[PDB]
Assembly symmetry: D3
Homo-oligomer: 282 residues x 6
């Protein structure tokens, strides 16, 4: 009873922003307790070491059943330092990352770490001439809408909820750690949408979101002429804004059919389900 976990956040990913809250949406679950720590947007090896140190430090008394590290590119220097420290700890760990994480997928399975790699969680257009705090927040709002309305966050919610159950049985083995890669095609194996065109619009939203990453990468790391890289990173943000609109359109189709899936948590932690607006969740 009452599973515990520590979430570590370094750098920012739409999924890492929301991961812990997706598990206790109304703060009324009594089978879980969480702690969240991090160094904000900084994700260099020095800053990531400090963050895992905090986590490992509080774990001593908190005693988490599992620890989660979430942020961009698990293949980078900083995140790699975190996988190192978590794999060689006494707590099972899961790494939440984006597409670049695929580079170290096998390496993570070798380290005995779990993972949830979200391909559509795309890097933003991080050039100083374009990305100020407001633009970053706008992009994150659009990405958050895409990940939520397409149902990607439900896949994540379900992974952590199943792990939370395995954890209560005090039996968390490596074979229990999730090993997920989420993308457009993930929706084909789900029953998220009652309307077929809502699922197809959600798929198109996820494909565009995944494609945003290549554009941001080109503008931030490849293109060196500012007359070209500023328009390039901005075009990636215009793409995400349309992906958010497709996701919104999909959700509205479910509303027209009074079939919006909702899977809220009960106080005991069980995931309920409902489709009709006035239907009690069971």
């Amino acid at each position: 009873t009452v599973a515990k976990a520590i979430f570590i956040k370094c750098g920012n990913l739409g999924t890492s922003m929301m991961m812990d809250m997706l598990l206790d949406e109304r703060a009324d679950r009594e089978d879980v307790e969480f702690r969240v720590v991090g160094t904000s947007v900084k994700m260099d090896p020095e800053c990531v070491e400090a963050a895992v140190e905090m986590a490992l430090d509080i774990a001593e008394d908190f005693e988490p059943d599992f620890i989660v590290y979430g942020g961009p590119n698990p293949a980078a220097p900083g995140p790699s330092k975190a996988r190192e420290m978590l794999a060689d700890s006494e707590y099972p760990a899961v790494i939440i990352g984006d597409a670049p994480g695929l580079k170290v997928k096998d390496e993570m399975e070798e380290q005995g770490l779990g993972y949830i790699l979200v391909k559509p969680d795309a890097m933003l257009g991080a050039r100083r001439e374009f990305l100020d705090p407001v633009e970053m927040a706008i992009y994150n709002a659009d990405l958050m809408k895409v990940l939520a309305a397409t149902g990607v966050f439900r896949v994540v919610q379900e992974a952590f909820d199943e792990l939370i159950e395995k954890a209560k049985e005090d039996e968390i083995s490596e074979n229990d750690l999730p090993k997920l890669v989420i993308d457009r095609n993930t929706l084909l194996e789900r029953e998220e949408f009652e309307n077929p065109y809502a699922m197809v619009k959600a798929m198109a939203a996820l494909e565009i979101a995944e494609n945003v990453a290549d554009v941001s990468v080109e503008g931030c790391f490849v293109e060196q002429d500012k007359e070209r890289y500023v328009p390039i990173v901005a075009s990636a943000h215009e793409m995400m804004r349309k992906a958010a609109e497709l996701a919104d359109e999909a959700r509205e189709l479910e509303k027209s059919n009074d079939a919006v899936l909702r899977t809220p948590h009960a106080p005991d932690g069980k995931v309920l389900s409902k489709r009709k607006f006035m239907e009690d969740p069971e």
Copy 2:
């Protein structure tokens, strides 16, 4: 000089989700270092105490210049416990909250605390029959878009950047702490928008967002018949979706005039500014 701060997050508010990130959007500032801790969505007295303890314990070796506590309703039991603990501590502190915080504005002033109260940061429709994880993320995506595109996040960015400069004097007087209340009318004193209709559409979005809170409160704490409260809380979410569309319309108007204000940070922390897309921030 490198300013340091600790952010504590209990419960969720749109402003508390982004507050730290607004200060180092591309993680390239070399004049700041942050630590972020919290108990996720739980904000009861027990959890908030644990949250502030973590922070104060870390504060020992971290030695921050100030501490920020962000979350809903500064007047509630948990947040009140945090105010007392921080007011008692040796660290200058700021409280980020929503409109219910106005109830203790005089009290926080006597406690020697600074505050940033964001009226449009409205409580969501937290009824189990309606609010599942996906719906909560969708609402927050709309609220984030409203607070970003209307310019509210820039007001918050500026307040903390002003405090960070003060901290570089290793002397933050109570007089230096912010005492801000942000709402629709805050825009009248800013020069956020070059186009006046973009300003008034942004004002309309903040008014609608502020008004969402009362609908949410009614459906969550007053109405007891589920046949009435489920529609009531869903109507609050439809309002926030349209507020986000208004904020988007305001920003597209600035785009049509090639007048989108951007204020990115330079590596040394200086806040630059630009309006024209192809112009460098200076």
Copy 3:
């Protein structure tokens, strides 16, 4: 039996613009006859007195079963004069007004008057620097769309049609007069919408429309600096435009379900009903 009524219009309210027309949409009812008089937009004591005099003078030979006075703020000087004059007359009467009318609800009950107070029928941003004839017509077009597509006009239609039936008994008791207050929550007791999301979008539109009044009041009667009040009244109009877009969205949802409620009058005054587009009203 042919029921007869006189409508008096002083000042302008969305509900007073349409009230009489809602009762005989195609002018084919043979069970009613109306006379409409007023002083246009002027609603001062002098004009309203003249307005009611015209009505009472016509009433002599016309012999109406009831008289209706519609216009903003039943509590203002002019409207109060009309209430006294009608309360004193021999004709059963109903007062159509907006939210400020709540201030004299007990008084109208003591005056033996009926009333229909429409909270979403909000005062417009009447400042010379902003409100010209075209802007006033645009605002009223949006308000009309909101009151029509959310179902508020059907509530008004039904109240008067019920009174007209009573009048066909040449005996309208004070007990027969309507005593209605319409707002967002009125929809919860109706079966206007087959789709629940159309109902909640309509509720959100009525909430926004109701909230417009406070912004208008602030910009017209409280704020004295033109640099602040012109933006304030324009923001109220942007809010009403989005309320109209929400009401339009609700109706398109009913169209997607081929469930648009239509309740036309038959030649003898009977109110028919239909939902499916190709179905005859019965």
Copy 4:
């Protein structure tokens, strides 16, 4: 000083709905005084005679400088009876009508009557299976938006305002009565729009609005198979809804250029003008 007029309304036209209010938008003009009378939607010869009788009756003491009759089809039996009674009276008169009014244009000039015929003020789809009170109000909201945002109402405002000046000079001759026909091409002789695409979108809105009339006529009077006439009249309403959207798009273009023309009345009655949002009207 202080001109007086009586407006008579029988049947409904978007222009007749708004005609008098366009002359005193904030009810603060002190150079005019108006009286409005009518028989609501009924426009048969019996009802129109009664309406003009009311007007002529109150004219005795009110002493209007001119009388206005507004409603659909001045060529119909009812409206023809009104032109008869007004032409043979001692008060100059103006007839406001729609396109069918062109049939009796010369006949009206022979009667010494003035006129303003608005081609885009189209008859609605008045079939019982489709048009209930709510649908009628929705259609009128869309038409009101078209007539207002395209600038048609300004043409009307200007005609009556010029007549109001001639009237104060106590010299209202037939050569002073307006003789206007308004349509899409009317916009080419105006300076309404600063942005050329706003004028072209407004022209397209007026062309569609004018074309709606032929569709309504076919569905109401020609087509007799209900499986065909119900879809036909509804298609006319869908056309008007898009005309309203084009008009809205035009106004938004003026907003993007901060060039929305506003011509408000001063208390003395002079028509002021302004373009920039923060510009005082002169």
Copy 5:
């Protein structure tokens, strides 16, 4: 058995652009073979004679079962020459045209020619000051969306598929050739739309499209003052852009009901049919 046909394209009409491709959408039909020839946008007598000569020269060895000539105005000099030449040949022929072709309907029947006249296939705003290559492509994109999404292209597909079945039996008589005039009302008897509001929106789109022709004709052939004709032809294109939006709205309504009609060809030529997205065409 393989049906053979030659298509001749002179000038451009939306239906002539697509006519042949609507018959073998994936190029996998094993029962047809076509040749397409033309003189691009030129449609004067010299060019049309050259186009038809090319077709008849090819016909000697190709041995087509029928020949189709498509392009604007069958009554113009160029197209009239094609009609004479085709009428003089041994090959069954069909003329695809626009509304102006109605003028020569009797001539074509006497010439033994079939015809499909598409009234909504409206002439564009062909004035040099407005119509450049890009604008000509944007208009055609909107017109193509209208003709496709309203179902007009399905009527054309059906007519030719019927002729192809007869061609296979070498049994195409003059009485088998189509004599079709397509417009808004054609939609009333199609089984195209499951949702009635989709049909009604599609009808509104075709009505607006048909009306665009009169505007283009006024701006290209009647009005001679450029300050007037440039805005006029531009307004025609704004109308067509809104007609495409209506057609898009109709299709989205069918998607909401998972009822989008699809009628693909099987490899053997059979026209299959389906409505539900996941249902195989049969």
Copy 6:
């Protein structure tokens, strides 16, 4: 002097549909004469050989200055046959294709052929269960809007207008033939858009359009389970519909600035230019 060219169309690409018409948009150019021939959508070797044979047979008497072959995938068997045949002839030739043509760029240069490869001209979702004639036309409408409004068609127009000037002097060498590959980045150096956000939205549209091809290819050639490939190809079409919306948004931004570039042909062939709506092209 009159330039002559033959266009061969096999299979369908958005650019091949429009290529010839972009050169004489109003059919009033006195300096060009074209012949167009093809086998409709069929592009297998047998059909392509027949199309090219038709062209070369016509060429003997027509004496074209250059020949253009346009259609999907220059590397496929059919198109490869056209390349061989055209490379073997005396007539300067240009191949218009899509991204798959990049594979044979070296072959074409060795063949002495020019080429214009349009990467955003994406293959559609050609599965029988989804693509019927109507869906194929809707997709092409969206693709045409993208290629036109983003300015891609202006690049094609310019390339051919340059070749036409050389054709007039009978001076078309192999080095004069284009070698162009068009994509999102092509827009960075065009002087197409006055507003920078219009350029950025246009770039986002071309990026999404280019990405549609990979989705269509996955659903048509890789995925073999219908429960998966039908949703996949449908998602490609939803992407293209949003790319057209972005292109539409870019054009509306240019309209807001009265800066829509237009480059019409004069009767003598000269390419004129204008930006302001009421400015004559020069």
